C-alpha cells in the first residue's frame, strides 16, 4: 500500500481517529475531543517507521485550508465540530419534548 | 396504539434496512464493471502476440483497477458506517411493533 | 546530414518547449515540477489517489 | 559508455545517427509508458465517478 492507501484504510478499519497524508507524503490522524480523552500513543512496526511526533490541539478557529494537509485536517475538525453541535442540538430537542410533556401534565 | 407507533416505527426500520441494501449493491455494481475490464484486458493480455513491454502497459491498468477496488470496499459507507471492507459483519434490523422481530442483514 | 541536424534541433527545441510551457490553468505539468499531487475523491478526508506526472 | 539522451542527439554522422535511432525508440517507450499510466488513471477515476454518483 502507498501512504494515501494506508490513510483510507486506517479511516475503515476504525471511527475513533481519522488519518490523512499532507503535501509532504506525511500521515497525520486527528482523534477528535468527542471521541477520545488524554492523549494518543502509537505503537507497532508502522508507526515505528512514521515517528507521530506530539500532539497540538486544533479546533475550528485555527482551522487553514492553504495547504493540503492543512485541508485534509480541516474536514477531520469540522466533522469533530458537527458532531458537537449536533449533540447539544439533540439535548435542546430533547428538553423541548419533555418540557412539553410537562406543561400538558400540568394543564391536566 | 403502542402497535400502531410501533409498526410506524416498524416501517421506517425496513426502509432504513433497504437504504443500506440498496447502497451496497450500487457499490457492488462497480465491482463488477471493474472485475470485468480487468477480464477483458487479462484475455488481451495472454495473446501469444503481445511481447513483455505490451504486458506490463497492460499490467499498469490492473493495478490502478486493483487499487480501485479496494478503494470502492475501504471508502462505501452509509453516513460513515462503512460497509464493504468487512467490518459491517451482521446487522440485525428490527422490522415489527413488538421487540425480538428482526433480520440478520450480512454485508461481506 | 547537417540540414538534418537543423531539423533534429528544431524538433528537440520543440519538445522542451512543451514540456516547459503546457500548464493547465497556470500549473505546469510535464517540466517536472508537478512532481506527485493527490486528487482527494472522496466524502471523508483520507480518501486520496496520488497522480503523478513525469 | 556515456549517458546519451535525446537532447545530445547529433546527427551529423552516421554513428550518431544509428545511435540516435536507439535514444529515441526508448525515448518513445518512455513516453508511451507514461501515457498508458495517465489513461489507467483516468479510466479509474471514471469508475470512481460512477460509483460516487450511485
Redesign the interface.
Known sequence: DDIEEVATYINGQTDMVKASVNEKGQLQIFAGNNKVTGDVAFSGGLAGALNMQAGTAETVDTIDVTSVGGAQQSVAVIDSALKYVDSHRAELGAFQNRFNHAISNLDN | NVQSRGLDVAVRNANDGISIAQTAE??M??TT??LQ?MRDLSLQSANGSNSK?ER??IQ??I???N??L????????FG?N?LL?G?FSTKSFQIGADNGEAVMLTLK
Do not use: H, P, Y
Open positions: 450500487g457499490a455494481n462497480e464493471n471493474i475490464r513491454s506490463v502497459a499498469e491498468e493495478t490502478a483497477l487499487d480501485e479496494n478503494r470502492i470496499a475501504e471508502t462505501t459507507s460513515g462503512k471492507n467490518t
